[PDB]
Design an enzyme around this catalytic site. Sequence first.
Site, PDB file in Angstrom:
ATOM      1  N   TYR A 241     -34.015  79.478 -19.677  1.00 25.96           N
ATOM      2  CA  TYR A 241     -34.272  79.382 -20.510  1.00 25.96           C
ATOM      3  C   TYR A 241     -33.076  78.649 -21.195  1.00 25.96           C
ATOM      4  O   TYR A 241     -32.401  78.540 -22.072  1.00 25.96           O
ATOM      5  CB  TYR A 241     -34.972  80.677 -21.500  1.00 25.96           C
ATOM      6  CG  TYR A 241     -35.724  80.802 -22.189  1.00 25.96           C
ATOM      7  CD1 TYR A 241     -36.156  79.732 -22.358  1.00 25.96           C
ATOM      8  CD2 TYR A 241     -36.703  82.333 -21.460  1.00 25.96           C
ATOM      9  CE1 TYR A 241     -37.865  79.757 -22.740  1.00 25.96           C
ATOM     10  CE2 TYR A 241     -37.910  82.255 -21.618  1.00 25.96           C
ATOM     11  CZ  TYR A 241     -38.937  81.111 -21.855  1.00 25.96           C
ATOM     12  OH  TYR A 241     -39.889  81.874 -22.215  1.00 25.96           O
TER      13      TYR A 241
ATOM     14  N   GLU B  29     -34.762  76.194 -24.288  1.00 22.54           N
ATOM     15  CA  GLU B  29     -35.533  75.946 -25.085  1.00 22.54           C
ATOM     16  C   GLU B  29     -34.362  74.953 -26.220  1.00 22.54           C
ATOM     17  O   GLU B  29     -33.647  74.875 -26.229  1.00 22.54           O
ATOM     18  CB  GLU B  29     -36.256  76.789 -26.119  1.00 22.54           C
ATOM     19  CG  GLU B  29     -37.654  77.246 -25.499  1.00 22.54           C
ATOM     20  CD  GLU B  29     -38.568  77.766 -26.446  1.00 22.54           C
ATOM     21  OE1 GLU B  29     -37.831  78.327 -27.618  1.00 22.54           O
ATOM     22  OE2 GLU B  29     -39.472  78.548 -26.525  1.00 22.54           O
TER      23      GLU B  29
ATOM     24  N   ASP C 207     -51.023  55.259 -20.370  1.00 20.35           N
ATOM     25  CA  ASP C 207     -50.512  55.996 -19.377  1.00 20.35           C
ATOM     26  C   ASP C 207     -51.047  54.931 -18.432  1.00 20.35           C
ATOM     27  O   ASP C 207     -51.424  54.488 -17.507  1.00 20.35           O
ATOM     28  CB  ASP C 207     -52.522  56.951 -19.534  1.00 20.35           C
ATOM     29  CG  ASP C 207     -52.111  58.071 -18.258  1.00 20.35           C
ATOM     30  OD1 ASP C 207     -51.572  57.900 -17.889  1.00 20.35           O
ATOM     31  OD2 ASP C 207     -52.855  58.868 -18.548  1.00 20.35           O
TER      32      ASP C 207
ATOM     33  N   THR D 267     -47.180  61.010 -14.256  1.00 18.16           N
ATOM     34  CA  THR D 267     -46.957  62.124 -13.991  1.00 18.16           C
ATOM     35  C   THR D 267     -45.444  61.594 -12.789  1.00 18.16           C
ATOM     36  O   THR D 267     -45.623  60.504 -12.510  1.00 18.16           O
ATOM     37  CB  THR D 267     -47.772  62.586 -12.636  1.00 18.16           C
ATOM     38  OG1 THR D 267     -48.635  61.862 -11.859  1.00 18.16           O
ATOM     39  CG2 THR D 267     -48.807  62.913 -13.929  1.00 18.16           C
TER      40      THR D 267
ATOM     41  N   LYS E  48     -47.294  61.920  -7.702  1.00 17.28           N
ATOM     42  CA  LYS E  48     -48.634  61.071  -7.238  1.00 17.28           C
ATOM     43  C   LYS E  48     -47.332  59.660  -7.077  1.00 17.28           C
ATOM     44  O   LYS E  48     -46.877  59.744  -5.902  1.00 17.28           O
ATOM     45  CB  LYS E  48     -49.351  60.106  -8.390  1.00 17.28           C
ATOM     46  CG  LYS E  48     -50.211  61.487  -9.392  1.00 17.28           C
ATOM     47  CD  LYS E  48     -50.810  61.291 -10.008  1.00 17.28           C
ATOM     48  CE  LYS E  48     -52.157  62.277 -10.203  1.00 17.28           C
ATOM     49  NZ  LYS E  48     -51.945  63.072 -11.336  1.00 17.28           N
TER      50      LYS E  48
ATOM     51  N   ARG F 174     -43.829  67.817  -9.079  1.00 20.46           N
ATOM     52  CA  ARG F 174     -45.288  68.077  -9.767  1.00 20.46           C
ATOM     53  C   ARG F 174     -44.603  68.183 -11.139  1.00 20.46           C
ATOM     54  O   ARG F 174     -43.646  69.165 -11.482  1.00 20.46           O
ATOM     55  CB  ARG F 174     -46.313  69.346  -9.845  1.00 20.46           C
ATOM     56  CG  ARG F 174     -46.842  69.527  -8.135  1.00 20.46           C
ATOM     57  CD  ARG F 174     -47.718  69.936  -8.007  1.00 20.46           C
ATOM     58  NE  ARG F 174     -48.975  69.864  -8.468  1.00 20.46           N
ATOM     59  CZ  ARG F 174     -49.740  68.334  -7.896  1.00 20.46           C
ATOM     60  NH1 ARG F 174     -49.097  68.263  -6.996  1.00 20.46           N
ATOM     61  NH2 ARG F 174     -50.545  67.932  -8.402  1.00 20.46           N
TER      62      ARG F 174
END
Lengths: 389, 376
Positions: free
Chosen positions: A55, A57, A172, A198, A201, A207
């Site tokens: 974890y 954060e 984008d 992303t 791609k 991913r």
Amino acid sequence: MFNRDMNIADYDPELWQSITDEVQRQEDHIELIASENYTSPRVMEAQGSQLTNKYAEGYPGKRYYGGCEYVDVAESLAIERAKSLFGADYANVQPHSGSQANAAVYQALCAPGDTILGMMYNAVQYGILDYAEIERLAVEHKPTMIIAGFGIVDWAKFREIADKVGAYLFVDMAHVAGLVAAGLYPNPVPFADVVTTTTHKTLGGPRGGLILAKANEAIEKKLNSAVFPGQQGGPLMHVIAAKAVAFKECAEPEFAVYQQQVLDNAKAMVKSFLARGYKIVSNHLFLVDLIAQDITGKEADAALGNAHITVNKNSVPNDPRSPFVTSGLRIGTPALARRGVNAQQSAELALWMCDVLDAIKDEAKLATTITAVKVKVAALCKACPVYGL
Amino acid sequence: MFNRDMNIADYDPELWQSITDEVQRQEDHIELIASENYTSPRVMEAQGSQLTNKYAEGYPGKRYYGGCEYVDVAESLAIERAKSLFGADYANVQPHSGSQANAAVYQALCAPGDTILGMYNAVQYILDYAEIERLAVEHKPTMIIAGGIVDWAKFREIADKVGAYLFVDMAHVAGLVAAGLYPNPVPFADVVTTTTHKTLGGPRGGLILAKANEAIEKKLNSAVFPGQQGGPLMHVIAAKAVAFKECAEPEFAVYQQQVLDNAKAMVKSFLARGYKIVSNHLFLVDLIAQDITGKEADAALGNAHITVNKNVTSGLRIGTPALARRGVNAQQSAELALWMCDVLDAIKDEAKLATTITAVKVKVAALCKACPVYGL
Ligand SMILES: [Cl-]
Ligand SMILES: [Cl-]
Ligand SMILES: [Cl-]
């Protein structure tokens, strides 16, 4: 203690079978889905690591959790390599997906009910681009944010327009991220306030999502908080490590060569479709418009699939049919090129696709054609294996 | 062709170093962060698979992309197993995280400007069920949010009274619920969410569960996709499938009680040593009486290879899911807590702190070696 030899094959054979089946499918089907790729074994290695157990954060050096000293290194590498790759001053590598990257930009820069000029909020749209008209809409509607994305888009003109009306500029970078990384397409980072993409791609990585920005201390802090706690909690540290090694692979000279192959393959396919009488809307992706032949996208993608060619139906501009049927196919070559198919093979592949489309109304001839194309696709897949030794 | 021997170690030594360091740290540090765990090699195998290459927007048998026939098996197994594990009629295994699961529920069930009763116009509330009912009737929430033992049936009654949806975030008790050790909210709530990586011990991700209600199921489907997400992480969904199978083993309920036994043992130790505890698998060590800050405690303990979070209550937040997962037992948990008290006392007394840190470090190292997380 977990025995390191615990595995899915012995424990969960139905699940394992689906995995080995999918592995085999990726070999023996040609994939023309514009948004897919094949990522390297190093990316999968990182994604399969124990970093899933941490974890973390917060951000490197500024975590809400103890014990993050080593995952901070992986994340820092991913951040620094992303900045280097895109000449950015800021990179946020925590977004779980492009959806989370984009949502975070909206939350960072906009308040609900704000006006947004683009391609919860008051939307204004614009449709080669007419920059004169985009400017007129900008002046008329005073958007809080202007969005641009992917001919050659003039980032400097969007900056000019955003400047004129005091709007944020959000780009984008979907579907040109790899070309930008390779120095083959103008970089939006120097012009936009913030850029997203992303990572799976055209970059061919894991991913996930990515936020980039030119230097602006205030915007960077808004982006930090919008990703966390705004859109997310703990990041996927194993996927962040995968992002680090993918960004290293993307900076290799071979990657620009791969990107040009992606483009050359698409061009070869386009020339075959046009030569065979099929209309193209067009770049590493293009649409095959099927109006002239009275073929639906659904109809075409089913037939091509039976020939081991995986493509997606897609609406053409002003498509007379519903989005669940459509009158087109959308083709991209990132995966095709990544597995080593060359421009000549791509040309022939498109011709095989035309053979199928030409026969599609004739049941007997279509069956005969699919049988023939399958044999040709299998030979190509075998000649151009995705993974192996 | 990608050569399958391509690896990080040969190519990216600096990243490899951070990964091998993290693997070693996971062995040689006791982790007392409540929201962490150690997942199985099978979950990690799935996460490291080629399923990362598949785009599969939509749901099994209803995809917006072709080529999904095999990944549909993996997702159907995840869905079916989540349903069987929690007695749900509906399971959505696509949320990338707990955050995404919760965000989808708000979008599915609430409108902008709606009123919400929890613990958007927000109204906040042993729990006082009278007051909850009072506030519900008073403000007519579109949705009530909930999450000792909570009376789910009472929430259902109140929700029904005012015609509100009932949403339970089960993330704190998901493992206990799966193990049959805590009342299951699924028959009562309209929708339940959880993470998959905390007390469930699985991959990092989210999960949505629901009792049969076709209208709600449709809203949840579209809230997750395209509402909150695009393509799911199919490699992680496969990992959810094998994790949910592991969670159904009888071993899992034994593990869940061990988590609780370990917490109880540490708590008794702290109390016996004069450290105030605020309190199932999580507790707070209040350090105000000894005038020890979270920072200096965290720092000293970290130097003794004990990884804790500091916490409003001033002190430490401690949880035992990872501790139990790597096989530390209750007696060992009791001793661990006493070692931590030795460090805390050394700080407060300003006496032999460095030596005491070293002493606890070597004791912690022996405990870690006796209770390895992974090995052969
Ligand atoms: Cl096994
Ligand atoms: Cl290598
Ligand atoms: Cl969990």
